[PDB]
Amino acid sequence: SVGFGLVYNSVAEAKKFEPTYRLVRYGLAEKVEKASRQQRKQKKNRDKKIFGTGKRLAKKVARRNAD
Amino acid sequence: GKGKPRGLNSARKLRVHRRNNRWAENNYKKRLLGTAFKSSPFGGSSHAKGIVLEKLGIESKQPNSAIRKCVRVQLIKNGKKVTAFVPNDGCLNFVDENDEVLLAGFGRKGKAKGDIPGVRFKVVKVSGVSLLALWKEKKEKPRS
Amino acid sequence: AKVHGSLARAGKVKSQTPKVEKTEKPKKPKGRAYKRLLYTRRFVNVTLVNGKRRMNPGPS
Amino acid sequence: ARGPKKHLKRLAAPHHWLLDKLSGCYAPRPSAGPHKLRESLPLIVFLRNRLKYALNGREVKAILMQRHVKVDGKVRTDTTYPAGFMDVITLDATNENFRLVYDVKGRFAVHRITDEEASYKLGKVKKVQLGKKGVPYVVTHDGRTIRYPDPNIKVNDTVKIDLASGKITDFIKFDAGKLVYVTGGRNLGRIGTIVHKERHDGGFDLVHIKDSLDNTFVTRLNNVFVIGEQGKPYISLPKGKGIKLSIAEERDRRRAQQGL
Amino acid sequence: VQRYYKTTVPTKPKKPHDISAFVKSALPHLSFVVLGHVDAGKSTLMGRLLYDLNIVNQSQLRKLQRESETMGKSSFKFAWIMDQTNEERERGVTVSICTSHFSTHRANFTIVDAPGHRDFVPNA
Amino acid sequence: PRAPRTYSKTYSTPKRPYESSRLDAELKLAGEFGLKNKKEIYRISFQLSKIRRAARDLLTRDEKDPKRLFEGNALIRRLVRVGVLSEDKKKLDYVLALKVEDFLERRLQTQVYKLGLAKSVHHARVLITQRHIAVGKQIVNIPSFMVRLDSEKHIDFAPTSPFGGARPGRVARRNAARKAEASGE
RNA sequence: AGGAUAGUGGCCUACCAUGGUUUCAACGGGUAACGGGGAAUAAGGGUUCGAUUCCGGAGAGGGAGCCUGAGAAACGGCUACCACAUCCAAGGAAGGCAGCAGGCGCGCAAAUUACCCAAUCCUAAUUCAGGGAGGUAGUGACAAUAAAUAACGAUACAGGGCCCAUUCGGGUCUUGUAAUUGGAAUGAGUACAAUGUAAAUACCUUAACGAGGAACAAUUGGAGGGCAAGUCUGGUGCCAGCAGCCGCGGUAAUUCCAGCUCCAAUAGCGUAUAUUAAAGUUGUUGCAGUUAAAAAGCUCGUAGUUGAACUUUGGGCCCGGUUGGCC
Ligand SMILES: [Mg+2]
Numbered sequence A: 001s002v003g004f005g006l007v008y009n010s011v012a013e014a015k016k017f018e019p020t021y022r023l024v025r026y027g028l029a030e031k032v033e034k035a036s037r038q039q040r041k042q043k044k045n046r047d048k049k050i051f052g053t054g055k056r057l058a059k060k061v062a063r064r065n066a067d
Numbered sequence B: 001g002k003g004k005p006r007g008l009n010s011a012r013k014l015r016v017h018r019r020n021n022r023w024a025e026n027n028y029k030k031r032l033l034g035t036a037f038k039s040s041p042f043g044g045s046s047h048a049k050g051i052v053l054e055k056l057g058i059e060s061k062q063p064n065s066a067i068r069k070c071v072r073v074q075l076i077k078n079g080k081k082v083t084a085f086v087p088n089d090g091c092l093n094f095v096d097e098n099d100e101v102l103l104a105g106f107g108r109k110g111k112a113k114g115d116i117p118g119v120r121f122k123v124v125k126v127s128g129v130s131l132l133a134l135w136k137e138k139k140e141k142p143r144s
Numbered sequence C: 001a002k003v004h005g006s007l008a009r010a011g012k013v014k015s016q017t018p019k020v021e022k023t024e025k026p027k028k029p030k031g032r033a034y035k036r037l038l039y040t041r042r043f044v045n046v047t048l049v050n051g052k053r054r055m056n057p058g059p060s
Numbered sequence D: 001a002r003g004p005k006k007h008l009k010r011l012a013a014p015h016h017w018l019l020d021k022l023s024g025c026y027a028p029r030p031s032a033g034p035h036k037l038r039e040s041l042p043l044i045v046f047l048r049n050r051l052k053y054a055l056n057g058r059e060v061k062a063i064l065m066q067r068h069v070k071v072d073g074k075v076r077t078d079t080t081y082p083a084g085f086m087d088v089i090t091l092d093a094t095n096e097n098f099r100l101v102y103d104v105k106g107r108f109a110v111h112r113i114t115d116e117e118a119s120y121k122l123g124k125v126k127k128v129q130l131g132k133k134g135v136p137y138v139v140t141h142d143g144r145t146i147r148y149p150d151p152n153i154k155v156n157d158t159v160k161i162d163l164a165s166g167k168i169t170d171f172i173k174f175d176a177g178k179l180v181y182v183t184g185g186r187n188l189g190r191i192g193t194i195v196h197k198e199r200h201d202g203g204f205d206l207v208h209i210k211d212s213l214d215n216t217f218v219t220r221l222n223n224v225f226v227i228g229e230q231g232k233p234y235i236s237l238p239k240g241k242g243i244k245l246s247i248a249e250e251r252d253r254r255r256a257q258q259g260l
Numbered sequence E: 001v002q003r004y005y006k007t008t009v010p011t012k013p014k015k016p017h018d019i020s021a022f023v024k025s026a027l028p029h030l031s032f033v034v035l036g037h038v039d040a041g042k043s044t045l046m047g048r049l050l051y052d053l054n055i056v057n058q059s060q061l062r063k064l065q066r067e068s069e070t071m072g073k074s075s076f077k078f079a080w081i082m083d084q085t086n087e088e089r090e091r092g093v094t095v096s097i098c099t100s101h102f103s104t105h106r107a108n109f110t111i112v113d114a115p116g117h118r119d120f121v122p123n124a
Numbered sequence F: 001p002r003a004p005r006t007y008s009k010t011y012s013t014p015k016r017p018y019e020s021s022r023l024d025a026e027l028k029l030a031g032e033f034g035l036k037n038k039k040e041i042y043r044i045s046f047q048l049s050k051i052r053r054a055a056r057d058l059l060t061r062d063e064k065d066p067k068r069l070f071e072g073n074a075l076i077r078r079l080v081r082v083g084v085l086s087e088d089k090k091k092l093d094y095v096l097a098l099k100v101e102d103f104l105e106r107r108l109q110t111q112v113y114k115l116g117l118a119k120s121v122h123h124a125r126v127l128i129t130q131r132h133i134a135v136g137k138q139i140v141n142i143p144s145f146m147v148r149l150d151s152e153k154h155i156d157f158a159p160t161s162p163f164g165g166a167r168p169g170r171v172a173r174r175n176a177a178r179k180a181e182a183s184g185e
Numbered sequence G: 001a002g003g004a005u006a007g008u009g010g011c012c013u014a015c016c017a018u019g020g021u022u023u024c025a026a027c028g029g030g031u032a033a034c035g036g037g038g039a040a041u042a043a044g045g046g047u048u049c050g051a052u053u054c055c056g057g058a059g060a061g062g063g064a065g066c067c068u069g070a071g072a073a074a075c076g077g078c079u080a081c082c083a084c085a086u087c088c089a090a091g092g093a094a095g096g097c098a099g100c101a102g103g104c105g106c107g108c109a110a111a112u113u114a115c116c117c118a119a120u121c122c123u124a125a126u127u128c129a130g131g132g133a134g135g136u137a138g139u140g141a142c143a144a145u146a147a148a149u150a151a152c153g154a155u156a157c158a159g160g161g162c163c164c165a166u167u168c169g170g171g172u173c174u175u176g177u178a179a180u181u182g183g184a185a186u187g188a189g190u191a192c193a194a195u196g197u198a199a200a201u202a203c204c205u206u207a208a209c210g211a212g213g214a215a216c217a218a219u220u221g222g223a224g225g226g227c228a229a230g231u232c233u234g235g236u237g238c239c240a241g242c243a244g245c246c247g248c249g250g251u252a253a254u255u256c257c258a259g260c261u262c263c264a265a266u267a268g269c270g271u272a273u274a275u276u277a278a279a280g281u282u283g284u285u286g287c288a289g290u291u292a293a294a295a296a297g298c299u300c301g302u303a304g305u306u307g308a309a310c311u312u313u314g315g316g317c318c319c320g321g322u323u324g325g326c327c
């Protein structure tokens, strides 16, 4: 079996040059559990239609259901 | 000099008098003027699709005496009424009228086969059933 | 010739032959070993030499 | 086509980058810089395809962006920075000094030079004009302009850039009998001491080259780059020294020295 | 004969559930057919039971009342939200059946149509 | 889209498909060597045709030519290295008279038979496709392995793949299991 | 000469001149014509194809107009019209999938509303953000490469080697028909685990499983000639049909429908269309023109094509290189 290996001078230097997926295979860094890729694309397009923060628009919503 | 010119500055005469003599072939004549495109109802294609209008009882030409059991097929992309042939031993019972068909040729570039007059095309499939497999009884024709 | 013709016997000869069953024969070899069985029947043991050899004779 | 193109597909890259047909779809496009598109080579090509230090194109930014990498004195923190002919690549780590020179075959070589040689470089002047307020300037092949040169320096000469300032420390006059390193064409990488030059008033001047092995060949004026006098090369020549012998004798050295 | 394949091996699913425990937890389901005479109003009931809860509102039947006075049959305020077919609206009666599902708060219902004519008995 | 992966066919076909003098001759090549198809015969004749194109093109050129002497010596040495062309036939006029028989002799299927590891020419094919005898350390299971001249003496049984060492086998295990269980405990 | 433009220019506008192209084929029409690098065929010369992985051009339903900006007459920018078309409480608002999927329609004819930037590389105040570019996987007999569907013994009667052959010859150099059998060697598949990968699937690895024929059973065409392989048996009887071509079918049809046997190719094979070779049946290489298709009734005659001989040929020396001879 012909492979390829890397060995560093220390452990703290190994965390900044190695990719983030090899740290998950080895247990050195925990894998973050984000949303799906097609789910982040739909959240981004819903933030494009909201200009500003969004709490200002929510004040308009509570005055719509009353009247 | 065997009729043709042999001048060193005479390549123009040898390239025009070829083009005045390429109109004597068959293959060069059918390609430029669109004879396969305008006439010969398959529009430069290998197969097509049509609808059976009626069945034929076309008698074979001399010296043979037989009935070739042809059909009348009206095409979809052109709408021309084209006779068609069933190349099996009794798949005329396997076909009906007003059916989606699939047509092909004979291997003679038009030019009706001989002993079957006026028919230049054959039938391969009728509504996607592969009549070769029905003649060997491999599958079943649908009800609709 | 004519156009109007009879349509009553569209496959009658096929519908009157006696449908017989294929005989259960042993399996022929496939691919490479079929070329072994084909090589023996041509040069190992010639069946008959009646001037020239024949690959499918008749019973006589 | 409606704007400047930012991508460069593979198999449109030049041959001297030696990019493979597989392992990707797009080739590294160099940015604007000292050299042209075909005569340059990016820093992403020089590390992972020539030196094999990095592995992926994202890992190349771990070398270039941080520290310890400088090109001709200045840092040049850029992935696709065009580095071409006579560009001194100085690595502060590993005490290594590099010189981008062509092969005998015509490809960018890994040529290692000492600390004393990496201080200077040679640049062919292109033209000489008068700038603002009557100040003369020469334009080298890498876009470097030099204010107040020697008036003896004319077109198609070369200079010796100090790489700490812009002053000229040495100049070589274009004359018959100078070592000329051919840059461009089918004869890329050859040397060989100009015998004479044909005038050709009207453009595209031709220069006859007859080297030490008595091989006569003709190059244009755009390919001529003097590197010193008759003998005594001012820069360290690479392995092979630009001979380009026949392919029937290329296999003689590969079989008797290593195959035997 | 040899057309397709046939086996007698049932394939078990990945999530098996108990059959007798789901029937008690399921909603009550019915399949009732509405027969009757030719002129008995069996389809007017079908246009009114399919009017109450969630099926049709006032934004879709007031448009049907404009088509009721237009085509002459102004007395057919109901019995047209069930059948949307030509030659049924200008004559009055249906020509074929239709299956319209119904959902209420507690049970489940499936109401189907039935023609009343003696010629349309095989359709019934 | 990336670069197009090029590909070329390795076999050919004759102009006359039906010939008594050809089909009897090609079937002798499939009997003495154990080939399964006529395609593997046609694959050799296609490779034999590409060599005559690299030989007849050079015999129309003048001698002392750096194109003839380079490509010609590369054509002779490659055929000597695979063991087809002998040591006393390096004059380059002998590769045109080279036949189909010398190419099939250097295949690995008849090389096992001439060495003495297989009892027949068809027993060797079963030894090839069933993970047996290796060329070196590398195990080859394909009969179209062009055995070079230096790789002829290294042909030997594998460390795996039994009657090669220290392994009884798979179906021999259950044969020895049912014998010891029924007769013993 | 002016205007316009980033700039040259009848680009545009005034005044003036009457030119410009063309049988060496202008102009007009047709193109089922994006151009090229190239592709198929393969003695040579050629013929045919090029929508398409690269380069250049054009376009974003049809045309026209303009803003921002270094770069756009941009349409995943805007405005108007036309052709379509969406929501409406009918007051109005909004839209351009020849982007990635997917739907309808047209069709002889062509895939998933999947995963991810991890490679490839690009954009941004840029290492760490984003990218339906791109990659991965599914579908997939477009093509292409590699080659499973078996191999080896023993015995029973027969024959062909041979030593010795003295009337029963069996022994070992040995080919086969054997509806008695024998242990082996396997992979397709399944499957711990590992590896592969961003995470998986598959490959390459490897425990435990996995051939004795009812298998984990190879088909597709054909058996008159062309063209390789039957004058076998049954049915049909100028009917059904087979037949690219010549031709078969009324009593025993060597080509019909079937069985049996056999042949060709083989995980491939047949058919249809287009094209090339065959075609020296497009002939420049390389045709034919008395009678087979074909020299104008005849002469003059330009464009075109072609065109006699002749103006430094010999002689005498001196230096090497390039191969090959004798060593
Ligand atoms: Mg995201």
Ligand SMILES: [Mg+2]
Residues within 6 Å of the ligand: A047, A048
């Ligand atoms: Mg935002």
Ligand SMILES: [Mg+2]
Residues within 6 Å of the ligand: none
């Ligand atoms: Mg005529």
Ligand SMILES: [Mg+2]
Residues within 6 Å of the ligand: B024, B025, B026, G281
């Ligand atoms: Mg002709």
Ligand SMILES: [Mg+2]
Residues within 6 Å of the ligand: B077, B078
């Ligand atoms: Mg049409």
Ligand SMILES: [Mg+2]
Residues within 6 Å of the ligand: B076, B077, G106
């Ligand atoms: Mg249509």
Ligand SMILES: [Mg+2]
Residues within 6 Å of the ligand: B072, B073, B081, B082, B083
């Ligand atoms: Mg008709």
Ligand SMILES: [Mg+2]
Residues within 6 Å of the ligand: D029, D030, D031, D080
């Ligand atoms: Mg860049």
Ligand SMILES: [Mg+2]
Residues within 6 Å of the ligand: D061, D065, D077, D078, D079
């Ligand atoms: Mg950077």
Ligand SMILES: [Mg+2]
Residues within 6 Å of the ligand: E042, E043, E093, E094, E113, E114, E115, E116
């Ligand atoms: Mg009713």
Ligand SMILES: [Mg+2]
Residues within 6 Å of the ligand: E091, E092
């Ligand atoms: Mg009524």
Ligand SMILES: [Mg+2]
Residues within 6 Å of the ligand: F131, F160, F161
């Ligand atoms: Mg094994």
Ligand SMILES: [Mg+2]
Residues within 6 Å of the ligand: none
């Ligand atoms: Mg002007």
Ligand SMILES: [Mg+2]
Residues within 6 Å of the ligand: G005, G007
């Ligand atoms: Mg201008």
Ligand SMILES: [Mg+2]
Residues within 6 Å of the ligand: none
């Ligand atoms: Mg003017």
Ligand SMILES: [Mg+2]
Residues within 6 Å of the ligand: G017, G018, G019
């Ligand atoms: Mg004038």
Ligand SMILES: [Mg+2]
Residues within 6 Å of the ligand: G018
């Ligand atoms: Mg005029």
